[PDB]
């Protein structure tokens, strides 16, 4: 009652075995998700609504920028391998969609390294097998939910979130209701 299927979230109708828990697909590129993460800051409040034991992945996609958007999905890659992505992620935004300073594979690493990554990890790591790996394990991912755009994210690899049944108006209720959903999904 409270969530049906076709209202607040719809159910895969080719469900995908071996997803992770909680996955949450964007682009450096799509300027709503600038909205989720800066703004709205649903990343970081889902996670506070989530129960003990579940954890929440993002994946870059790269339809989205050409060229530049599948560097910076390798690049993303290397965020995760690294374990930096709690950091690296603003500057990313911010760089590309606001101060416009990313406009090539160096300035993103220029990035990288005013972070606090020596310019040896970061290029060491982006010719990595890990790097490569998951680059055609996020490929993987998105063509696998038959992705089309995002933001987005998938729950249990059988629940796909939809954003438009739910209160557009105050936008921390939005949050809160996007996040609750998020929950209960998780415990179904």
């Given at each position: 009652?409270?969530?049906?299927?076709?209202?607040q979230?719809?159910?895969?109708?080719?469900?995908?075995?071996?997803?992770?828990q909680?996955?949450?697909?964007?682009?450096?590129?799509?300027?709503?998700?600038?909205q989720?993460?800066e703004?709205?800051?649903?990343?970081?409040n889902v996670?506070?609504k989530?129960p003990?034991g579940?954890?929440?992945t993002?994946?870059?996609?790269?339809?989205?920028?050409?060229?530049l958007?599948?560097?910076?999905?390798?690049?993303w890659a290397v965020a995760?391998a690294?374990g930096v992505?709690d950091k690296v992620?603003?500057?990313?935004?911010?760089?590309?969609?606001?101060?416009?300073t990313?406009?090539?594979a160096?300035?993103?690493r220029?990035?990288?390294?005013?972070?606090?990554?020596?310019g040896e990890?970061?290029d060491?790591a982006w010719?990595?097998f890990?790097?490569k790996?998951?680059?055609?394990?996020?490929?993987?991912?998105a063509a696998?939910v038959?992705?089309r755009?995002?933001?987005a994210?998938?729950?249990n690899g059988?629940?796909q979130?939809?954003?438009?049944g739910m209160?557009t108006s105050?936008?921390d209720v939005?949050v809160?209701?996007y996040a609750?959903?998020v929950?209960?999904?998780?415990?179904?």
């Amino acid at each position: 009652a409270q969530y049906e299927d076709g209202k607040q979230y719809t159910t895969l109708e080719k469900p995908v075995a071996g997803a992770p828990q909680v996955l949450e697909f964007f682009s450096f590129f799509c300027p709503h998700c600038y909205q989720f993460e800066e703004v709205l800051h649903i990343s970081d409040n889902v996670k506070k609504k989530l129960p003990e034991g579940v954890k929440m992945t993002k994946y870059h996609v790269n339809f989205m920028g050409g060229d530049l958007g599948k560097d910076l999905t390798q690049a993303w890659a290397v965020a995760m391998a690294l374990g930096v992505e709690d950091k690296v992620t603003v500057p990313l935004f911010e760089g590309v969609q606001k101060t416009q300073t990313i406009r090539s594979a160096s300035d993103i690493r220029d990035v990288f390294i005013n972070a606090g990554i020596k310019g040896e990890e970061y290029d060491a790591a982006w010719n990595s097998f890990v790097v490569k790996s998951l680059v055609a394990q996020q490929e993987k991912a998105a063509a696998d939910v038959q992705l089309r755009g995002v933001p987005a994210m998938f729950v249990n690899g059988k629940y796909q979130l939809n954003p438009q049944g739910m209160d557009t108006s105050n936008m921390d209720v939005f949050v809160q209701q996007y996040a609750d959903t998020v929950k209960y999904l998780s415990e179904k």
